[PDB]
Amino acid sequence: AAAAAAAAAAAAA
Amino acid sequence: AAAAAAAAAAAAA
Amino acid sequence: EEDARWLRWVTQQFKTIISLQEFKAALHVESFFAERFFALFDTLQELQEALTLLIHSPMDKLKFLFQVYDIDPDELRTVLQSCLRESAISLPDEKLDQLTLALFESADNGAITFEELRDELQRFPGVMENLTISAAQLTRAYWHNHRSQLFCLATYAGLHVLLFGLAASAHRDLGASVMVAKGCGQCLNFDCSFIAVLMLRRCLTWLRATWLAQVLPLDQNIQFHQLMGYVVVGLSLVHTVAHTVNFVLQAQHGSASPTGVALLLLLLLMFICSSSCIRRSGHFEVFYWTHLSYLLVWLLLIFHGPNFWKWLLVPGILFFLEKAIGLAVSRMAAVCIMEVNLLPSKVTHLLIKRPPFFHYRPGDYLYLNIPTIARYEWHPFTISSAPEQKDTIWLHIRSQGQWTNRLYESFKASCNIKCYIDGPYGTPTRRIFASEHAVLIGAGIGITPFASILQSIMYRHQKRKHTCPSCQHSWIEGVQDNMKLHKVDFIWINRDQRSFEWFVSLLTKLEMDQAEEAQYGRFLELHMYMTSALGKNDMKAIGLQMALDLLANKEKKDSITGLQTRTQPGRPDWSKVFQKVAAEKKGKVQVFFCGSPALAKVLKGHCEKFGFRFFQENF
Amino acid sequence: EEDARWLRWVTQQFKTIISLQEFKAALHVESFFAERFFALFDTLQELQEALTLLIHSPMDKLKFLFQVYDIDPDELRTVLQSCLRESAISLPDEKLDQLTLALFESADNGAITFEELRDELQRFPGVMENLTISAAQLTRAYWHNHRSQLFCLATYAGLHVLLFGLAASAHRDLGASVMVAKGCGQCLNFDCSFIAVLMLRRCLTWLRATWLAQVLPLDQNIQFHQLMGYVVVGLSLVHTVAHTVNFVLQAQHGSASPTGVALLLLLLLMFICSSSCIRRSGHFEVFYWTHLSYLLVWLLLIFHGPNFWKWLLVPGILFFLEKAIGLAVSRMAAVCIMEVNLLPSKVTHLLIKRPPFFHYRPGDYLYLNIPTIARYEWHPFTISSAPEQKDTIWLHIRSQGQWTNRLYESFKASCNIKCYIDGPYGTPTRRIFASEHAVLIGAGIGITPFASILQSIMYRHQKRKHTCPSCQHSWIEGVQDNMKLHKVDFIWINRDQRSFEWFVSLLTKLEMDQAEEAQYGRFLELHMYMTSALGKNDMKAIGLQMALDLLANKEKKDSITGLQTRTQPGRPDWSKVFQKVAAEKKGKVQVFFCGSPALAKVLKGHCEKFGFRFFQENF
Ligand SMILES: Cc1cc2nc3c(=O)[nH]c(=O)nc-3n(C[C@H](O)[C@H](O)[C@H](O)COP(=O)(O)OP(=O)(O)OC[C@H]3O[C@@H](n4cnc5c(N)ncnc54)[C@H](O)[C@@H]3O)c2cc1C
Ligand SMILES: Cc1cc2nc3c(=O)[nH]c(=O)nc-3n(C[C@H](O)[C@H](O)[C@H](O)COP(=O)(O)OP(=O)(O)OC[C@H]3O[C@@H](n4cnc5c(N)ncnc54)[C@H](O)[C@@H]3O)c2cc1C
Ligand SMILES: NC(=O)C1=CN([C@@H]2O[C@H](COP(=O)(O)OP(=O)(O)OC[C@H]3O[C@@H](n4cnc5c(N)ncnc54)[C@H](OP(=O)(O)O)[C@@H]3O)[C@@H](O)[C@H]2O)C=CC1
Ligand SMILES: NC(=O)C1=CN([C@@H]2O[C@H](COP(=O)(O)OP(=O)(O)OC[C@H]3O[C@@H](n4cnc5c(N)ncnc54)[C@H](OP(=O)(O)O)[C@@H]3O)[C@@H](O)[C@H]2O)C=CC1
Ligand code: HEB
Ligand code: HEB
Ligand code: HEB
Ligand code: HEB
Ligand SMILES: CCCCCCCCCCCC(=O)OC[C@H](COP(=O)([O-])O)OC(=O)CCCCCCCCCCC
Ligand SMILES: CCCCCCCCCCCC(=O)OC[C@H](COP(=O)([O-])O)OC(=O)CCCCCCCCCCC
Ligand SMILES: [Zn+2]
């Protein structure tokens, strides 16, 4: 959900 | 006078 | 112990009945844990064998839970939610998200695996021990606190009884309805005029500096005002029903009665719009405008009360003197909010660029104004950043109401907003920095000035550590005409770290920054009592916060190991505390308190027994 | 040049007439110098030969004077008195005595001899060059200074014209003597009531901090009060003669007239006792008691002026509010005067033991009280000691009046007297210590706050010089959150060092203490202009003071050689001064002024031309 996108962005960052 | 006593005290000091 | 009792209860329930519903009924639960447990076990033999592996090894229990939830960020979060006995003090959801992201990231590119997650968990120094491992009014202290507020209410009600009685006595001739009306009128004269004075926030900042704040409450003024407002709205209604019953009895011109209808309607407007529902909804300008009619209620009433103009004159001159003494740029500064961090448990952290010639002492508050939130509202907030910090000004703004909630919830949906602060106000705290072995005690939520005070203490104490540039023989100089303390305790007693997770992280930061230096001497000792966590097993949400802060500043557990043993549950034992403060010899102890008056007297007793010099700082 | 003119005049007089009286007549003088000169010479040949040896070698002239006075402390003092052209600025008699004692002592056990006195004099670095060697209203600046005082007097006189006219107009019916009496009465109503307010020295300390002191004079209050007193004593006399002429015209009971006789007598008592002769004589309690009758004049007048109680009410409530707000230990401290040094030119130096929690900013005054002098008088004095000095508090109390003269002359006939100071009051001077290349300019006698400011600047500037204890690599650290200045000028312009010999010695001390460091950078530059000494030949009394101070702290002339060339005579040349300040690049110049407003505008012009940030500090 919202936190999954957060983890994806953190891994991409 | 006053300054003579001052010189005397300074010599004694 | 709990595992054995659970096993006994399961064995007793098993002998009393296995279907999935029966298993849930025996467990007295809907449970994602129960269904997966059944799906992995699929009889009394199967249940006992599964329980024995589950009972008779914490890491094994965590692996069991992992396989249960295994059906990888959102899932690990549920694992940690399952592994927390959220009982009295809790881990805020922001800190939980941070913890789960920290585990998942260092463990792994996609989903994590429990095997390497095990050694990743063991790598965390404090996450293991703090994660619980399992499957599933009348007191003399009360009146001692509230005696000042009770005396203020009693003086108010006694003055009202005096005025009502003196008016109804003189007007005893007129019969049975001019007595009531005359009593209510003589009350309204004072009620309006002095409902003004409660809003001299240019004088409350002056009375609050003095010792008068210790005797009479200066923080209840807004809600003594909301009380005089209600008594006015009641007494004017009784006044009106008295003067209409009187005219009805006269049934069986002048400018006094129609102005009466006008005043009744204006007061019902100031009373309908001033409710909570008007500022709870984001109408902070509508509340301000409809209240701006207190002028028209004050105008009509001069043409109403033949003697009212004297009442309105003394506090009215005071009030407009103040509202004029404050103008556009009196002490304002249209500073820019540099950054806004939303700390956990709904607290907003504002970094507002410091005005060049903005000099404050530690523990000085300021009236904040943010036109995006509310255009004309000025709320006060303590500066929680030491003056030695030159760039910005911190404010930790906990959501305790409708404006502060608006500030938070406005920033959460989203940082250069327009801000007009109003100067530093505060009692001088030079009694602290000129002392030796100060014992800063603080209780409740009035500790935001202790944040500034401890940060300034530590800045000034590290400023007296000189390092030679040539031979690097770093020595410690003596007093520097600003600071004299040889030791500083700090004891923070509070029911729980509800909105003060930033403060727990601040104490952790101070202990980290002066535990690398504590081999030869420890300057600051930061205690913490929680008074609602019955046993140290309950204070496992703070251990998690400290083990999480040890990973932003990569350090060893020995940095906090001082603070871990001073982070105690339940109330203090003041005998042992003061006696240990006495065992050390670093000067003459000077206790400083910031909290309720019942605890203030308890501490004053213990202090004058032990021979310390008690204080009560009012910031 | 003067020697040649003297020789020519002697030759012309000789040819015009030698007896002793004729020689004195030619010299146009009674002269101990003339008689001994005759006795050592005993004709035109003798006079010319003696003059040639006396004309055609300064040390020879001094030996000549020595043999003249030779007929040894008191005699050398006369020699030095003969060798000083006391013209515009002078050497105070205390400094003269010190100089003569310093020469006589180091020269010699009894009387000194001129031969060794010669080399003793040559040993003094600056005494030779500074001892002169010989045988024998309407300006726009004025109104610019006094425009504020003139506007205050004009507002006062205009309000009086208004009240007199409005009263004599309404009472135009009553004939020719009730007009005068009614006008004077309507004036007295205001005169008494507001002659009160001038004595709110608890509010003047607050108005003086603000910028209002720049626009209206707050230091004339005592002598605006002595002016309202005289106008009251005139108007009440006219009121009384009007009401007795009126009763005389009525010739051709009530409590209004006998209270009138009582008020006339009470006012003549408050006017006879308040003269200068009552405090000039050491009656400082008699003045205070007879003035304490302003209560009875204020009492009788309530029973006199039917409308007077409103006038007396507003300023009277103010005045008694203040006199009550100040009680026994409001901010007082019964400190002990540690030592009292009587500096030259009748200035008293008080060292008063600092109260423990007495924190002041540099430039803060205090109200001093000494019951031995005057039991109820509180005079204000600037603290002339930097706050960094922790032991004592200095005050340099120049004899400008009757209390200060009493203090001096009482200590001179004679040191643990009883002293009750009253707190620090003063404008904040943090604008200075947060600056770069400040240019402190001061003019007139309002420089006692610059003593404290310069001492504090130097304390803080030497505090940022660290010396490694191990390898002694002494370095200079940067700013220390208290001070930022890279350079500090100080320009002191005054007509002469009349009572400020302590200040000249202070500037000499600061230059001594930071000329041992100037080899690589000079932090403070201390200028001094004298504006009454027409030429540098006249500023030889200051050279003597500096050469005398170089012998209390044994140093080389190169310590002062910086200050000797910045100790100039006559007014400044602001073009060159500001242009040199500009030639240096040490930051952005921030001129700070403390002096008259005509010079303030001159400096503001030059400053905004050159691009500095002018200020006007009001301390
Ligand atoms: C010196 C001082 C420092 C403070 N510092 C902080 C701080 O750092 N962080 C923080 O979260 N809170 C702080 N407060 C308390 C409070 O949260 C804010 O001052 C202010 O209440 C915010 O308004 P609100 O809309 O949240 O209150 P509201 O929702 O309008 O009212 C709820 C409560 O706040 C009180 N209140 C309302 N308006 C004001 C006002 N203008 N001034 C004072 N109390 C008011 C009411 O009496 C009531 O108790 C401080 C209070 C004081 C006196
Ligand atoms: C902030 C401030 C600091 C001062 N610091 C010094 C200082 O360090 N040294 C110094 O010698 N003088 C100082 N003075 C001025 C003055 O000498 C003393 O303040 C005070 O005048 C001493 O009383 P007096 O008996 O000498 O005056 P008086 O002889 O009584 O009066 C003569 C003059 O002093 C004025 N004066 C009289 N009484 C007072 C009073 N209570 N307050 C103010 N002025 C008064 C009169 O207006 C008149 O101009 C200062 C003045 C102020 C306002
Ligand atoms: N000027 C005034 O009139 C002031 C009034 N107040 C009043 O203070 C009242 C109380 O607020 P609050 O601060 O919440 O109440 P407390 O002061 O009781 O709570 C403060 C902390 O002190 C702890 N504590 C209380 N008694 C003891 C004890 N004997 N030994 C050790 N620890 C103790 C409490 O723990 P536990 O949870 O076990 O109590 C709590 O954690 C407020 O209602 C307010 O009106 C506040 C400030 C000044
Ligand atoms: N708030 C107010 O209303 C204030 C009023 N005053 C008024 O200030 C008046 C003057 O007092 P005083 O300070 O004696 O007068 P000045 O300020 O004239 O004397 C101060 C020094 O400035 C020197 N000076 C004056 N003009 C110049 C110039 N153009 N260039 C260089 N140097 C100059 C003077 O030298 P010279 O001897 O050549 O003039 C004197 O040495 C007082 O009468 C007082 O009333 C004082 C302070 C504030
Ligand atoms: C604010 C509120 C209020 C209100 C609402 C009101 C409302 C009213 N009101 Fe009032 N009042 C008042 C407040 C008031 N009020 C007062 C304060 C007074 C005064 C009293 C005395 O002072 O005595 C009066 C007074 C009054 C009187 C008396 C008269 C005179 O002047 O003396 C009358 C009659 C009345 C009526 C009335 C009416 C009818 C009404 C309704 C409509 N009133
Ligand atoms: C008439 C008279 C009056 C009355 C009746 C009233 C009534 C009232 N009120 Fe008031 N207020 C007032 C007058 C008043 N008032 C004033 C004056 C003020 C102030 C404002 C300013 O400051 O401006 C107030 C203010 C106020 C406030 C504040 C705001 C902020 O926050 O800041 C509040 C909350 C209130 C409430 C109230 C209430 C609830 C009531 C009941 C109805 N208030
Ligand atoms: C302080 C000073 C003073 C003085 C000294 C005086 C002195 C006098 N005085 Fe005198 N007054 C006065 C101040 C005065 N005063 C006044 C302020 C008045 C008021 C006026 C009016 O207000 O109109 C009078 C007033 C008065 C009067 C009027 C009445 C009434 O009540 O109305 C009379 C008659 C008098 C007389 C008199 C006399 C006879 C005398 C002398 C003996 N007146
Ligand atoms: C009635 C009213 C009055 C009057 C008429 C007066 C009048 C007078 N005056 Fe007087 N004063 C006064 C009221 C007065 N006064 C007062 C209130 C005071 C204040 C004191 C105290 O603070 O306590 C004085 C104070 C005072 C002083 C101050 C002291 C010191 O130094 O500190 C003086 C100097 C005076 C002077 C005077 C004179 C010269 C006169 C004229 C006669 N004066
Ligand atoms: C600068 C001036 C300072 C003035 C200081 C005023 C101090 C007294 C303020 C009293 C305000 C008050 O009662 O508090 C609101 C309470 C909740 O208080 P708390 O328990 O949260 O502290 O909420 C309530 O429960 C209110 C109940 C009070 C009912 C009182 C009725 C009185 C009727 C009088 C009629 C004549
Ligand atoms: C906090 C309140 C602040 C009030 C500020 C008051 C400012 C004005 C005060 C005026 C006092 C005064 O005149 O000074 C005394 C003068 C000598 O002054 P100076 O030249 O030494 O400055 O000595 C004199 O020569 C006095 C002559 C003045 C004569 C004026 C006559 C006015 C008559 C009015 C009748 C209605
Ligand atoms: Zn070194």
Author numbering:
A (entry chain B), B (entry chain D): 6 to 18
C (entry chain A), D (entry chain C): 4 to 20, 27 to 38, 40 to 52, 60 to 73, 75 to 89, 96 to 132, 136 to 163, 180 to 295, ...
Which statements did the authors publish about this structure?
NADPH oxidase 5 (NOX5) catalyzes the production of superoxide free radicals and regulates physiological processes from sperm motility to cardiac rhythm. NOX5 catalyzes the electron transfer from cytosolic NADPH to extracellular oxygen to produce superoxide (O2-) in the presence of intracellular Ca2+ ions. Like DUOX1-2, Ca2+ activates NOX5 by binding to its regulatory EF-hand domain (EFD). Each protomer contains a catalytic core with TMD, FBD and NBD and a regulatory EFD.
Focused refinement followed by symmetry expansion was performed to improve the local resolution of cytosolic domain of NOX5 in the pre-reaction state. Here we first use the pre-reaction state to describe the overall structure of NOX5. NOX5 forms homodimers rather than homotetramers as previously reported. Briefly, the TMD contains six transmembrane helices (TM1–6) and binds two heme molecules, and the cytosolic DHD binds FAD and NADPH. In the pre-reaction state, EF1 and EF2 have a low local resolution, which only allows the assignment of secondary structures. Part of INS1 displayed a helical density that should belong to PhosR, extending from the FBD and packed against the EFD. We observed a helix from the PhosR motif in the pre-reaction structure but not intermediate state 3 structure, docking against a negatively charged surface on the EFD. PhosR may stabilize the EFD in the inactive state, but this motif is released upon phosphorylation, facilitating the transition of the EFD to active conformations. Instead, the corresponding residue, Val362 and three other residues (Cys235, Val275 and Leu332) are located between the two hemes and might contribute to electron transfer. The distance between NADPH and FAD, which is >10 Å, is not optimal for transferring electrons, as NADPH and FAD are solvent-exposed.
